[PDB]
């Protein structure tokens, strides 16, 4: 009582493993699909398929499909767009799509935006990446002419300092936007709200600190340099604030660039940096409008020694700080707001980068009393290490 089962005809884009002239009781056959095609019984992908001829006249399992792998509609790229290369709406095995970032305010990182639909069902970059690319904000753009110092306080125009950030709530301080979801500031400015990031009301995009027209952001987490000690000097006075959401990048909101290896070239003694603020840490009155001042780097040895004459503490100025200031810029001109960025012009790239963070300094605006700033370049690995975990 051993008879044949209907000769197995493979589905399109599939084949039968053991090709026998006839199949009878107990015998078997499997179906394997071409590369880029998958076994489907209905809408269910199978690990594999193997039908066995029973005592009946029929096979125990019906023929499955060998259907092309579909990577599905490509995800939306934030601050970017997608283009179908192979053809409109085509998302199956070996189809090609091409991501692009918005033209002037974003640049593409992580790869060139080209993804192919692979056999595993994932859109895959040339580097083998199965995640979306990232549209990073272009940094260091400004509306200013140059570093053409026009002595003393000046009024900021729209787009002059698009990285400028105002930090309200528990503290009153400043910062600078990095990328579209980080804010660089001084540790002394936000140390007390280290265990309470929510209480940091973060605002940007506005020249006027009292304007109802600003862009709002909220801190997710605050990262104090572990080397900063609150009740013992300003060494390692640097902190990062993570924003809960990314901010829109336009003419009024653009991050400052981080200083690259060769940034020391443009921050030598007598090189000109710019500090901006409302006067949050000076005295008397706050400015309604954003102000700035062009100030030269002061010889470190001259500044070290200036802050050692009596009555003063020693070890005040460390290798983790730089000094800048004018030798006679009354009131209007001074250090800046606590946490604010001291910026410089990379002349090769025409991009502004942050070189200092307003940290501390004398009360008497400045001669012989310069501002002291956290030397940002010493902390690049510290900054890179935190921003890479997010």
UniProtKB/Swiss-Prot annotation:
Disulfide bonds listed in the record: 5-53, 33-66, 71-117, 101-135, 139-257, 303-323, 334-365
Q: Locate the Peptidase S1 domain: which residues?
A: 150-388
Summed up, the tissue specificity of this protein is: Plasma.
Site feature: Cleavage: 149-150
Q: How is it modified after translation?
A: The iron and 2-oxoglutarate dependent 3-hydroxylation of aspartate and asparagine is (R) stereospecific within EGF domains. The uncleaved zymogen is inactive towards synthetic substrates, but has sufficient activity to effect autocatalytic cleavage.
**Complexes and interactors:** Homodimer; disulfide-linked. Binds MBL2. Isoform 2 binds to MASP1. Binds SERPING1. Dimerization and MBL2 binding requires calcium ions.
The task this protein performs is described as: Serum protease that plays an important role in the activation of the complement system via mannose-binding lectin. After activation by auto-catalytic cleavage it cleaves C2 and C4, leading to their activation and to the formation of C3 convertase.
Q: Which medical condition is this protein associated with? A: MASP2 deficiency: A disorder that results in autoimmune manifestations, recurrent severe infections, and chronic inflammatory disease.
Q: Which family does it belong to?
A: Belongs to the peptidase S1 family.
Protein name as it appears in the record: Mannan-binding lectin serine protease 2
Organism of derivation:
Homo sapiens (Human)
Gene coding for it = MASP2
